[PDB]
Amino acid sequence: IPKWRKTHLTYRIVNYTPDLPKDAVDSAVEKALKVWEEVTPLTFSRLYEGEADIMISFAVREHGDFYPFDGPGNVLAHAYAPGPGINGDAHFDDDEQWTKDTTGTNLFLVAAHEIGHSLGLFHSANTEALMYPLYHSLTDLTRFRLSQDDINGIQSLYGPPP
Ligand SMILES: [Ca+2]
Ligand SMILES: [Ca+2]
Ligand SMILES: [Ca+2]
Ligand SMILES: [Zn+2]
Ligand SMILES: [Zn+2]
Structure with a gap:
């Protein structure tokens, strides 16, 4: 089945981009995991050494897999389905300048989307959904919220929270 066999996943941030302070990276990833966690029975925990379920890293060009990055712009990041x-891994192109505001390439926004793929979600045809295929940002980050479409997609796979 297109999903995880357990309801608890471990995650590890293998390396950090120099674009933002160490702490902003942690905060971005944590928030990203939290949004999915809020609408399902799934839980997460961090590891600092070894292989975790979801290995997050930042890389450039050819980085040991089938899909080399393309330099600044265009593809920003990609993730793999459950297994x-x-x-389940998520990789971010370091040829981008990652930020924590509305100016350029927001880490939280991209990560929230990539984590959606790590959990089994495909693309939505709804222009308002987190899982919509084309990149965009928001005027105000505090106004972020998953669309019902995003909710139904994750819940059809894992069910609602108790
Ligand atoms: Ca993995
Ligand atoms: Ca790129
Ligand atoms: Ca960079
Ligand atoms: Zn990759
Ligand atoms: Zn996508």
């Missing part, structure tokens, strides 16, 4: 090994 062991590389599956």
Whole structure:
């Protein structure tokens, strides 16, 4: 089945981009995980060494897999579907300048979307959904919220929270 066999996943941030302070990166990823966690029975916990379920890293060009990055612009990041090994992993192109505001390439926004893929979600045809295929940002980050479409998609796979 297109999903995880357990309801608890471990995650590890393998390396950090120099674009933002160490703490802003942690905060971005944590918030990203939290949005999915709020609408399902799933839980997460961090590891600092070893192989975790979701291995997050920042890389440039050819980085040991089938999909080399393309330099600044265009593809910003990609993730793999549920499963062991590389599956479930999320990679970010470091040729981008990652930020924590509304100016350029917001880490939280991209990560929230990439984590959606790590949990089994496909693309939505709804222009308002987090899982919509084309990149965009928001005027105000505090106004972020998943669309019902996003909710139904994740819940059809894992069910609602108790
Ligand atoms: Ca993995
Ligand atoms: Ca790129
Ligand atoms: Ca960079
Ligand atoms: Zn990759
Ligand atoms: Zn996508």
